[PDB]
């Protein structure tokens, strides 16, 4: 059940690529209707729009390293460290 939850996890992750990217075609048409006196309206917004949401494309670079982390990835057993001292005392006499 590690697959369904990382399945919804890249199934919400691809809903961010339709999220940060629509923050592209949002900035584009603001330069076409542009060339006007006040055409700097969308410049306080769009440029606050793709300045703001372009750090939501930062959060889209952390997702795949998590699914590349599936590629990349009292209470002790230290009783076996008494295997470690053990080998040493057999090492001292041997």
């Amino acid at each position: 059940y590690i697959q369904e939850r990382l399945k919804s996890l890249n199934d919400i992750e691809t809903q961010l690529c339709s999220m940060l990217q629509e923050a592209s075609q949002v900035t584009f048409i603001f330069g076409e209707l542009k060339r006007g006196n006040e055409s700097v309206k969308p410049q306080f917004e769009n440029h606050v729009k793709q300045f703001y949401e372009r750090l939501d494309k930062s959060t889209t670079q952390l997702r795949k390293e998590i699914q590349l982390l599936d590629e990349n990835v009292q209470d002790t057993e230290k009783m076996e460290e008494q295997l470690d001292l053990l080998s040493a005392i057999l090492d001292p006499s041997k």
Binding site: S18, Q21, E22, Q25, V26, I29, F30, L33, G36, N37, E38, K41, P42
Partner: protein, 159 residues
């Protein structure tokens, strides 16, 4: 005078009740609590002030005709002078901040043009409008075993 004007005031009381809780939470400092909850519970209570601020603009003909102070009966002999700046309303520094709205009004401005400059203000807004039907149009783009009782009834033997 305003048989329904009082039902507007009870809706000023519903919105004023947004202040009640808010300000008694202010004093609820300085020990820190629930930013998400309160912030959202402060924002939400603020909005409605504007929406009762809205339901007033439909009645805006009676704040213009103004219905105004035919209203003061009491004869509160002097001490209502504080009810007089209180009845008085008028504008606070917020007015000092209204001229900051006047220098933000900046320029502009009339005396500036008469008309055809204004008709270039309205023809200036209306073109911000069409850019939005080009906007919404590109937006829709990506949009079994028996319940343990009977088993304890099976600890009662029941089959």
């Amino acid at each position: 005078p305003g048989q329904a004007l009082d039902a507007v005031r009870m809706r000023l009381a519903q919105l004023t009740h947004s202040l009640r809780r808010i300000r008694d939470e202010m004093s609820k400092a300085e020990l820190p609590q629930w930013y998400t909850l309160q912030s959202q519970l402060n924002v939400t209570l603020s909005q409605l002030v504007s929406v009762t601020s809205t339901l007033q603009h439909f009645q805006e003909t009676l704040d213009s005709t103004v219905v105004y102070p035919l209203p003061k009966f009491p004869t509160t002999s002097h001490e209502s002078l504080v009810t007089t700046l209180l009845r008085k309303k008028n504008i606070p520094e917020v007015d000092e901040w209204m001229k900051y709205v006047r220098e933000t009004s900046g320029v502009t401005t009339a005396l500036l043009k008469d008309e055809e400059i204004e008709k270039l203000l309205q023809q200036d807004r209306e073109i911000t409008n069409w850019a939005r039907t080009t906007f919404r149009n590109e937006y829709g783009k990506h949009d079994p075993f028996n319940v343990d009782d009977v088993l304890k009834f099976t600890f009662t033997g029941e089959k």
